[PDB]
Symmetry: D2
Subunit: 430 residues, 4 copies
């Protein structure tokens, strides 16, 4: 028969629950969503199958969907991002969770497949982060497509895929771009990585940032956070970019912008925030400085040629889980973190719960949208109404004791807008 | 026939003005690159552009860029105190109809704007505005010229806000290009520009120290974002007010305290309004403020600080120097007003530096050229420049800063599904 | 009998030895000390008894002392700062070490006492951090005093104790104030906590810093470092000081400066860097927002009234090691870290090895000076010559690839100084 | 006798200077607290103080403070460009012998100082120096006045440096107090002061964009730290140069790149010498600078930049405006020099704001009182002020910033072993 779940140690449920209690008090968005849409169960009948890093933050989201009458089955969208105590807590809660830190490509695939069919029917809703789930159903379980009502993508890379599929006509089910919600990409990607990247490098290497020259590939919302994080600790940051705008942004901020070919000979730390392949190749590792720390924080491990290292390094010693130190022919060494997988989740705990509350509340609203108002979202990737976006940030103001100002009638008139309604044009960039 | 060829404060300043223009030029690669690339082409040939933008050394460079492109131009400042006399003299000497000077009166203001409407041979063809003052003047009092204008290009947030309002009500009769909302503008001019000019205007006017003082910044948009950081960098504790939950959540995540003006008015030692909205600082606030609290506005129109109240309420009002008034209230405390409520950077200083302005002005030039040569592509309404152009404005400036951009390899351009030259971000990207 | 050592599990030696390999490459100072005095063996005959946080950095220290021909016996200066794999590595190398994470007061004392007598006589030198060792001997083993050639403190609180002792003429052995060495106090205390403070709060709680209000008690080198870290992550930092000079500095940096009686009402995060007692009391706890994180970074755990919480809280749950969460009679909760002990070392790994190389390079120099030139240092607390101070700083320039400028003959004569000798007046504050 | 009672640019500027002083006094609590406490006691009665320090608004308040304490003063500036005419006017109108104006010549500089040696009642009693020129004039040309001078007061590092080199050679014949190395001075005036005044000078002189530029700051001392932090706060990439391994590591730990001037001279866009040393920027360096590179100095004396070389090698030299010259080398590239090498914060601006200057001048007034009231407490040499006085200086400025200082309790003070009022730090503390 099938397994009710599959975690590393159900025994961790105790500790994991203690952590969920703490994260809950830090995620007012998800809690404000609970108490409001609990007595109504707007997701009643929904059989949500999610694929997202099984962490304490995700655990609070999973229970929130449930609190809303939703039926759920989960898996982690990465073999190294799962938090066993958090996964156990959910497992103990009676939810079908299939994840654990340190899964093999095989087990990873298997884990997702275990969330495809519920006790009484296949999935009708999707909650993805990376696009791995949707890709599996569209390429291996097409039969389910018409059965699935909607989708909600979490990250940049996953959303990049959706548009691609829609533009090629491969996408056969509606989908809401959660990553590009203002209260997401401008907070999660930016502030979330501003605090999580350094944590991943720290727990893994304990290296001192100050005095070190760090190279950040790409200056998007993620790279902006990483660069700021490193600079704030006293590190000289260099940036690489392909977009003249982003590149000019980094320059206006006092960052040096050059190519990886030149920068590889200066960096003491390397972070890839690009969403594309071949960012750091052997040509680069060969010129690096002894004991240069290298990691990737992008969604997919396709930026650092970890393969070249294994097939070219003279020695390969593992310091501890997710931390390896290669020795090249030149005699110098290289430090690889999480085997190239997103370092903040692989070597640490990912973004703190507060910022995650922002993303996850967008996620919940999205599920409620593709499930309650299918007519508003036909086959194609859509954005969540700016009215809801503003609402998400609104829910997180109180905790920070922030006092929002209210537009008077005269003022609302003068500006031509509702003191309650949206405050910015859809094209606004924040 | 007695229409003056120009009208500045002192033609003698042209010499010193030209000097500043040569230096500024070597800071504005965008514009200069637009000249060498379109000088012989003369895309703006036949066009008669009538602009209404702050007559500064940076604007002068834009005026000559348009002229180098075979465009007939007549200019006027869009704010009574923003004009730089030596800059107007230089242009006035170049033989261009200039009507602007520091210290204009409401009367003279409107006058100047009207002295640019008719060129020696025909009405205006295009409208280069900043604030909407020109666009509105025509639409209401000179509607007969509407069908003779191939398009408008708005410079700032307030002006562009006005256009949309007109289009919504269908009151907008001539096409328009939203320049302010071009990434290489709003996210640069509004942000990095104010970050260096605000303190500049306050410093030149009061010389007050920022380190240690508490500063209140009304609004946290692109201008507020830059103002807050400028203040913060100098050691001042910044407090922000906001109506937008998102914007407010942004300032909090940046270590800023966010509250209402009603409460911040009792703490502030320096106040800066970055809102395009009225009624920000009122008597209620002035009465609570601290002794010698500095008050100023950096928004387009002087509709944020109720200066009228200060005039009709202070026990006395002294003038330390031009654009700097020190009122004394009944409570015995004093208040320092800058530029009589007008945008402080330009009113008390010299506005954004030349390098950054090159960005916005290059977008302005691409707008004129676009709205002029390709009118059969811009219906009646407000539009944005193609991201290809927006991106072009950025790259044109990388050189100066010696920025070495990376080129996508063939494999990468495929993996990402985009041209190694074509647009790099979707239309919804927020940078 | 006398155990040859005592650690948590010597099976961690392999991992500890690896952690040292990496560390040795991050501490140029200590390594330049070995290659320069290896054959010289200046510390020959010296029986050094050390009492300092048994960590990866401290391990590289001990091994340096040994390379210089000294005999060493070690113990930690705190019950929670010991890093087991680092303590194990040292134990396996034959170096007597009595330290493990999670000691008790009884075992703490016991550990120090195992380092008093060597396999061939009582201790010669005292490498202490906090005064526990120098105080233990001056009060229980005065007969060993005349046999001790010198003492070298490490931290502020400890050096303070030394002065207080000399003043009352209780100090019966020449000591060198290492902490107040420029390359120490202005780097270790400052940049060190700037990276380690947040590190300790995160591994323990994973809380988001951005948005929170943080109250840092005190504004000294440590206070400065912590404060900068917190606001670097987007937290609003409120300071509390008793020294008007330090207070003006904070205000000139943009920090609000009030009393704890005031701040205890706004703080979401509390960090005490004061060197004294009674900073956060029950009166304060009763007013902290729900789930306020309170920790201490001062040497001794005398800044936070942890007893009060235990005898007044209506609930107390242990999330995990060094992480307790209480619930007051008012219903609001409080998260205490390391039971009030220095959090950076109790909840993390202390400062990164690079900045510690600075501190420890001075420590070794202090041991050599005191042991090699006993006469040159009579009974009392002394500083290290500025020529030596600059030497330390200059030894780490290479690693960061810094190009120091050499004064020309003309320039040197103009400035009235040697192009090699001291570059600053003795009262220079940097 | 023809000795003029004063000599200023335009005493008709006094009206405006007085206004400036009004605002200034309200920003200098320390200086006003001094008079507010000794106005009656008149502790400086009988003192004939001759001060040689940048005649500015801040300095004006300093002078009026001493006068309020019963001292008699004749003043002169210690730099040919740091004088602010309207300020020098106010003091003049107030009936105080002041010889200084903006634009002086070496000859007039020497003259201006000598006019402050003899008072109506005879030779000077006290010295208030900044740079040491006055103390050097007396010691070398008027050694017969030495036995008549009680004490000296050095404001800046350079001067203080001279006092030691003098005492060391035993050529210092009068007790002097090192005011610069007082915590409330060097760790506030040099650091935070320049952090706000360096840019100000650069801006008013050039209006250049700081964001995106590469800046090179020679020296990482109290001034270097301040300047560097300011520049990068605006988005400039700051490269540092140093000869002291400690300072060098400090800058490196702050994320600054530290190389040699020989290298940085090839990639800098803005140069700022904050060293008190010679030969920092030479012709070999100029010849490698990027086009239109702005070069300036903020060190006391103009000896860091080889301005002489520029005049004797450039093929073109155009003066844009006072204190702003643009050269063109044989390599075809241009170079913007400010204030001809003199301290740019005062040469092209208004120096440090009034607030922080209060910290410096408070120690100044304090030193005078000490040196004049307790002469026996200071043998021949150079000393610092008691730490308890330093704390008092800072504490006197907490009020305006609204800082709530904390008081040690009985138990606390006992545990720490220090008076809940007495000095809080050991003599060697570095803050
Ligand atoms: N680990 C996390 O917590 C987290 C959080 C959010 C997003 N992400 C991931 O981060 C990535 C992208 O960042 P964003 O999400 O900030 O998106 P952008 O902001 O979409 O991201 C990438 C940036 O890199 C640049 N770039 C692309 N190819 C490059 C090359 N070869 N060299 C140099 N620069 C290049 C682009 O011009 C762009 O500015 C995705 O993979 C996304 O899924 C991770
Ligand atoms: N002086 C200059 O150099 C310069 C340069 C660019 C723009 N501007 C002007 O600055 C203004 C707006 O800034 P942006 O940055 O252009 O636009 P947003 O970024 O459009 O601007 C205003 C911000 O203020 C907030 N706000 C609105 N009403 C408020 C109220 N009553 N209280 C508190 N906050 C309120 C909004 O939510 C928004 O975040 C316009 O007037 C524009 O023309 C001046
Ligand atoms: N955990 C670590 O890594 C580390 C590293 C270095 C020092 N320390 C410890 O930090 C402490 C002191 O810091 P420093 O930075 O070493 O020394 P200072 O800089 O000597 O330290 C304390 C500061 O707190 C202030 N202060 C004292 N009592 C106060 C009170 N009741 N309220 C508010 N402010 C008060 C003082 O004015 C002073 O500025 C010592 O206990 C020292 O051993 C810890
Ligand atoms: N204009 C102002 O407002 C103001 C205010 C305070 C001090 N100053 C002046 O600033 C100067 C010194 O600064 P401080 O900050 O006073 O003193 P430090 O802090 O004494 O000053 C200089 C620093 O430069 C370094 N240095 C010396 N020679 C060098 C060389 N050839 N190359 C590279 N680096 C070198 C030293 O190692 C030192 O750290 C003096 O001239 C002083 O009078 C000006
Ligand atoms: N602690 C965390 N818990 C859950 N999800 C997280 C966390 N930190 C970051 N993420 C997400 C993650 F990985 C990516 C990019 O794929 C996102 O865009 C985020 O939503
Ligand atoms: N120095 C300057 N020169 C010319 N135009 C400037 C300058 N500084 C700011 N601005 C413009 C200005 F005023 C507004 C808002 O109305 C803008 O949005 C800018 O383009
Ligand atoms: N990782 C570390 N390893 C060893 N010692 C450290 C570390 N981080 C900080 N310290 C010391 C510590 F604890 C105190 C205060 O007592 C100091 O002053 C430091 O030398
Ligand atoms: N606004 C100002 N007013 C008076 N003196 C000032 C000012 N700004 C800086 N200084 C002094 C100055 F010039 C030097 C270096 O010689 C110092 O060290 C300062 O005290």
């Amino acid at each position: 028969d099938k397994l009710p779940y599959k975690v590393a140690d159900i025994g961790l449920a105790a500790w994991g629950r203690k952590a969920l209690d703490i994260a809950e008090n830090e995620m007012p968005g998800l809690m404000r969503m609970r108490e409001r849409y609990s007595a109504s169960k707007p997701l009643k009948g929904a059989r949500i199958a999610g694929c997202l890093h099984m962490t304490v933050e995700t655990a609070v989201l999973i229970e929130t969907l449930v609190t809303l009458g939703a039926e759920v089955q989960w898996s982690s969208c990465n073999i190294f991002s799962t938090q066993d105590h958090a996964a156990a807590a959910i497992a103990k809660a009676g939810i079908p969770v299939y994840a654990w830190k340190g899964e093999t490509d095989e087990e990873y695939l298997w884990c997702i497949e275990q969330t495809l069919y519920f006790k009484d029917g296949p999935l009708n809703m999707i909650l993805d982060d990376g696009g791995d789930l949707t890709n599996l159903i569209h390429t291996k379980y097409p039969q389910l497509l018409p059965g699935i009502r909607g989708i909600s993508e979490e990250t940049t890379t996953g959303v990049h895929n959706l548009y691609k599929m829609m533009a090629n006509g491969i996408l056969k089910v509606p989908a809401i771009n959660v990553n590009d919600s203002v209260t997401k990409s401008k907070f999660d990607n930016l502030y979330g990585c501003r605090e999580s990247l350094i944590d991943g490098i720290k727990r893994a290497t304990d290296v001192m940032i100050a005095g070190k020259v760090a190279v950040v590939a790409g200056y998007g919302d993620v790279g902006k956070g990483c660069a700021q994080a490193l600079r704030g600790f006293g590190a000289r940051v260099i940036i690489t970019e392909i977009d003249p705008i982003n590149a000019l942004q980094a320059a206006m901020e006092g960052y040096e912008v050059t190519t990886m070919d030149e920068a590889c000979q200066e960096g003491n730390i390397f972070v890839t925030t690009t969403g594309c392949i071949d960012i750091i190749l052997g040509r680069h590792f060969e010129q690096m400085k002894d004991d240069a720390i290298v990691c990737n924080i992008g969604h997919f491990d396709v930026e650092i040629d970890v393969k070249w290292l294994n097939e070219n390094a003279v020695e390969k010693v593992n310091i501890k889980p997710q931390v390896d130190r290669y020795r090249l022919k030149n005699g110098r060494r290289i430090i690889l973190l999480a085997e190239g997988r997103l370092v903040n989740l692989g070597c640490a705990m990912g973004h703190p719960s507060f910022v995650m509350s922002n993303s996850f509340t967008n996620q919940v609203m999205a599920q409620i949208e593709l499930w309650t108002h299918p007519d508003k979202y036909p086959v194609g990737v859509h954005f969540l109404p700016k009215k809801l976006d503003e609402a998400v940030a609104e829910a997180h103001l109180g905790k920070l004791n922030v006092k929002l100002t209210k537009l008077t009638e005269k003022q609302a008139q003068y500006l031509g807008m509702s003191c309650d309604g949206p405050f910015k044009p859809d094209h606004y960039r924040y």
